[PDB]
Design a protein around this nucleic acid. Structure first.
Lengths: 55, 90, 89
DNA sequence: AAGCACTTTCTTAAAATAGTG
DNA sequence: CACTATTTTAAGAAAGTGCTT
């Protein structure tokens, strides 16, 4: 059921520090680079946002 | 696992409730293991933040508590305060 | 541990006594951690093979036992028997 | 469609420990 | 007690569920 690479997660987190929310196009562009799916980046950002409030 | 946590009151109610249920199972499991491995009589009484009761006993709570009431001798008797000191000195 | 041990009575008196003192500290340590982390009132009463008493309480044993005395509400109540069944995943 | 609030399943690093002088 | 290989515990990560706009 597989976790993301530390390079994938490094870029996801670096991007999250700049922007808590992505647009659909922005999301697709990122997914392409990280070698993930749009759904995977969407849900990653959803989860990261949830955890951010549970600090 | 994944990150060292400091032993201080968990601030976030929901985190506190998930951590509680995990560590309560873990504690009762270790109590069970000790009871069986070392042939001992154990009683464990837990009241959570909401004052809900959870109890484990090796054999029977009443038998252990009876044996406790009618011990009549000094024994190892520890509180959170005494524990804090014992951990800081290592 | 250097070897995986099955959960049965240790049948070597000295091994039983060393394992006991180790796991008793471990158990009280975890009880302390739970009490502090989750703001809980815990009481732990242990009688070893020789019927010697060892006890931990978060704040005060008598206060917890009093609170436990008058409490007639359906609450989780587990013994070695019930645990045995629960451990078959 | 996507947000949020959980919840669930599993992985993995931290903590506990069996065997030993 | 100390040491440490090895096991066990539980925190955290991805996906599931269910509801709202």
């Amino acid at each position: 059921r597989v976790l993301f690479s530390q390079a994938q997660v490094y870029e996801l987190e670096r991007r999250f520090k700049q922007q808590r929310y992505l647009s659909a196009p922005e999301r697709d562009q990122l997914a392409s680079v990280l070698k993930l799916t749009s759904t995977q980046v969407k849900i990653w950002f959803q989860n990261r946002r949830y955890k951010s409030k549970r600090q | 696992g994944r990150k060292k946590i400091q032993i201080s009151r968990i601030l976030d109610q929901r985190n506190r409730q998930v951590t509680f249920t995990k560590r309560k199972f873990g504690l009762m499991k270790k109590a069970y293991e000790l009871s069986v491995l070392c042939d001992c009589e154990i009683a464990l009484i837990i009241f959570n933040s909401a004052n809900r009761l959870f109890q484990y006993a090796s054999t029977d709570m009443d038998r252990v508590l009876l044996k406790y009431t009618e011990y009549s001798e000094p024994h190892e008797s520890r509180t959170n305060t005494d524990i804090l000191e014992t951990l800081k000195r290592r």
